[PDB]
Write a protein that binds this ligand. Sequence first.
Ligand code: CLA
Ligand code: PID
Ligand code: KC1
Ligand code: KC1
Ligand code: BCR
Lengths: 126, 160, 160, 165, 176
Amino acid sequence: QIRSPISDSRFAKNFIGNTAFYREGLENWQRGLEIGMAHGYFLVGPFTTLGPLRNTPEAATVGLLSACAVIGIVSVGGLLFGATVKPRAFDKDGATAGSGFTEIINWHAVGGLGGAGFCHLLLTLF
Amino acid sequence: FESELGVQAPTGFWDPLGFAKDGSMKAFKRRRASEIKHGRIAMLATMGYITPEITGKFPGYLSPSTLLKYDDIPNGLGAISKVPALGWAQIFVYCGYAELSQDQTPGSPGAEGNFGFKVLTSSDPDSLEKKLASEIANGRLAMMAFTGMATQDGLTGSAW
Amino acid sequence: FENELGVQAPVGFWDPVGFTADGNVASFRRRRTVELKHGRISMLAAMGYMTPEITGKFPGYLSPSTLLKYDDIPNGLGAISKVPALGWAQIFVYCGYAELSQDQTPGSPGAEGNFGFKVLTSSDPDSLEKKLASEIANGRLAMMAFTGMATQDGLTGSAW
Amino acid sequence: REAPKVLAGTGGPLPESFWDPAGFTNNKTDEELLFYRAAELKHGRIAMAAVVGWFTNASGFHYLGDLWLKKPASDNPIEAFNQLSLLGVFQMVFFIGCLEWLTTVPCPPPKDAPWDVIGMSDVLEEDTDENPMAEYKKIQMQELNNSRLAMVAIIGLIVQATTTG
Amino acid sequence: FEGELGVTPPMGYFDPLGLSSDGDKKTFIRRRKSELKNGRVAMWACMGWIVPEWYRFPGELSPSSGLKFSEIPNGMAALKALPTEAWAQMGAFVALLELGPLWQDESRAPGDFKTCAKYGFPMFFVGGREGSDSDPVKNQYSLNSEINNGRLAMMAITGMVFQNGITGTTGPEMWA
Ligand code: CLA
Ligand SMILES: CC(=O)O[C@H]1CC(C)(C)C(=C=C/C(C)=C/C=C/C=C/C=C(C)/C=C2C=C(/C=C/[C@@]34O[C@]3(C)C[C@@H](O)CC4(C)C)C(=O)O/2)[C@](C)(O)C1
Ligand code: KC1
Ligand code: KC1
Ligand SMILES: CC1=C(/C=C/C(C)=C/C=C/C(C)=C/C=C/C=C(C)/C=C/C=C(C)/C=C/C2=C(C)CCCC2(C)C)C(C)(C)CCC1
């Protein structure tokens, strides 16, 4: 609970607090979708270039496939975490332990696929 | 606001794009000030176009050092580059002093278009509204006429 | 506005058209300001038109990069061109500092004329008012004199 | 005329040197004067950064653009900026827009101190007399004075260039 | 949600699948903002598909590349014909619009942006000098006109995208 400007200034409180993982008014699926879109759009990057098939016409497609694979693997890991730990930090009233976190991870997988596809689209075009 | 000087008769409260809904007052007050000032400038400029056309260009030399007989400066667009940059600076300074005179800050007597000309101060014969509304209506008409005049001056190529 | 500066022996009510409202305290304070300022500037200008011809122009360069020995610059008017724009810009920045250092907004002690240049720093004696009156009288004389000299070298070559 | 007490001795040749010679402070509510200070500090911080960027571009430290242009970029910061592709310029515009969005929509600045975009006023206490090393007002004045100086310095650099070469 | 702006006599309160069957006013407000923004974007896109076939702009896109407005193929071929700098600049402009003047304030009405006048007039872009604020009761006819015109233009832009995908062209064949 120590106070530091990096972790207790108003910018930090309203920045981490307004992220998808913490933003008020967001359903679990919205948080998952937003985090997934961010992760998927990021992950296409380091694969299309800096990869085995760099200097090939299908570099963007291979990067997209690898980014989707990484999103799927981390989503399986998140499902594993929700099945084992059941974080319970996002569950609504009643429901079951870890339902909110599992929904977040599933929609993170969906958003990761979406963001990876969007990055691949923006690479093939323009 | 639905009863100010602007509403003449041919059109009532003419706010087609709804700038008045939930009248912000201060917004409307400063927009009325802008309307008054723009109309006055438009009237002056419409003079500055239609009078040099009929009345000949000033008998004089404008710049005593750079041979501007007012005849090499054409009436219309393009005179921006013909009048000296120093002359433009000086007319700019005149306007700047005229405004940086009596304040037109929000709420001040300068903020409603009142500045202190009083050329036509009719002795309150139910005619203060006459002169105010006439100035506003002629301001709107002169701004529209100015826009049309500048479009004719540029589109056609010169003057009219 | 009776016992300030202007009252002296030959005249002291000299105002054929001024004192428009006979009041406007702020207007008269601003007018005494411009009086003291224009007076000082006119005195410096008259000296700068008076020191060159007798006790001849300084020996030196004034611009060793551009070799503009103080003497070869024309005495009157024409000096506005040959002195480099670098030096003119430095003159202008000195003037801007001298005016904007102390606040010129009306009401301040610097508004009425006291710029804090108390060389003799008269410790509010009876000498204060007589020094003020001599300053303002020589200021009016210097304004007239420098307008005359500027006209003279505008119509006949150098300052004479 | 004294300071409007919402600025309250925060600038001038000296700290208590309310300097406005244009009547840009009178008959103005506290929110507007706070806006003026926030605009001054933002313009400053931007300038103070821009002066350092100019002097590190005009000193040959112009990588990341040495590589983008694939050849040594111009030392003149204006020409160096012109050498940048429109993609890079609009990336800079987009990043500054995202930063401005951050400090308005998700992380609004404190109401009484709009210049505190980082929200530093929620972790700092104040300058107090019990503190032998109290310098928060002093560093605020350092920031303000360097801001006001760099605001004219960067304009001197920009207008001096593109008109003299 | 019958009684909200958008309900129009030709269909009435539609909701066949019952997406907004429950109350959850937050979800309805979100979907109303989405509907209004998609409708506005689709009306913009339908104009951007109609007008270029009549008024190819006078000048040139890139003066240093000679690309004139009269040669970029209309429809879904400018995606791979217009230079990527132009597309990136358009995307950045839309980003600045939505992050700046056109960021929805949750207290205001769903489609209400303070910076815009009634018929969509950008009363910002003029010193940034604010605009209207939503009054549903007086402009209700214009409100529903905008909403269902946006619906029609969304269906229209989808149809025209598929027309370009099928016929390959955007001349007379696409429009039939
Ligand atoms: C910039 C000039 C200007 C300004 C500030 C105003 C301001 C005002 N007018 Mg007004 N008016 C103007 C010009 C202007 N008018 C002109 C030229 C006409 C003639 C067509 C009128 C006719 C008119 C009527 C008939 C009425 C008003 C009324 C009003 C008041 C309420 C409406 C409102 O909020 O408008 C806010 C101000 C604006 C919306 C101005 C924005 C103009 C946009 C930006 C441009 C419009 C298109 C333009 C021609 C494009 C030219 C090209 C350009 C991009 C280069 C307000 C004080 C009403 C009133 O007085 O009620 C009491 C009223 O009944 N006006
Ligand atoms: C800067 C400035 O001054 O601007 C200001 C000016 C304004 C006016 C205030 C303003 C605004 C907004 C306004 C009111 C504009 C209105 C928009 C409405 C658009 C409606 C549209 C598109 C609807 C359609 C549907 C279409 C589809 C039809 C077809 O194609 C289809 C599917 C298939 C073809 O086979 C056959 C077809 C039948 C052909 C079509 O084609 O039309 C603005 C810009 O916001 C500000
Ligand atoms: C009483 C104070 C006064 C003086 C003493 C003065 C003197 C000169 N004016 Mg002048 N002037 C005003 C006041 C004064 N002007 C006012 C109130 C206005 C209305 C806005 C105005 C308008 C213009 C315009 C439009 C031009 C102009 C010029 C010159 C000029 C030529 C110098 C040169 O050519 O060497 C000289 C000496 C021309 C120009 O060149 O500006 C430098 C030119 O175009 N002035
Ligand atoms: C083409 C026609 C035209 C229109 C349609 C128009 C409209 C508006 N002008 Mg305007 N204008 C000109 C032409 C037009 N202006 C010209 C030729 C000049 C040079 C003489 C000029 C000068 C200024 C200045 C100095 C200001 C100004 C403003 C506004 C304003 C905001 C009011 C409001 O929205 O509250 C609106 C709507 C003020 C503003 O807020 O600017 C940030 C302001 O200070 N204008
Ligand atoms: C640089 C910088 C920074 C930042 C960084 C970062 C963090 C970045 C990131 C970035 C990013 C990371 C971005 C992202 C983006 C994303 C996107 C743009 C996405 C999109 C997506 C989409 C759009 C999708 C869609 C979809 C879905 C939803 C599903 C289905 C399918 C589809 C496709 C339809 C900082 C401040 C630190 C500082 C320094 C500078």
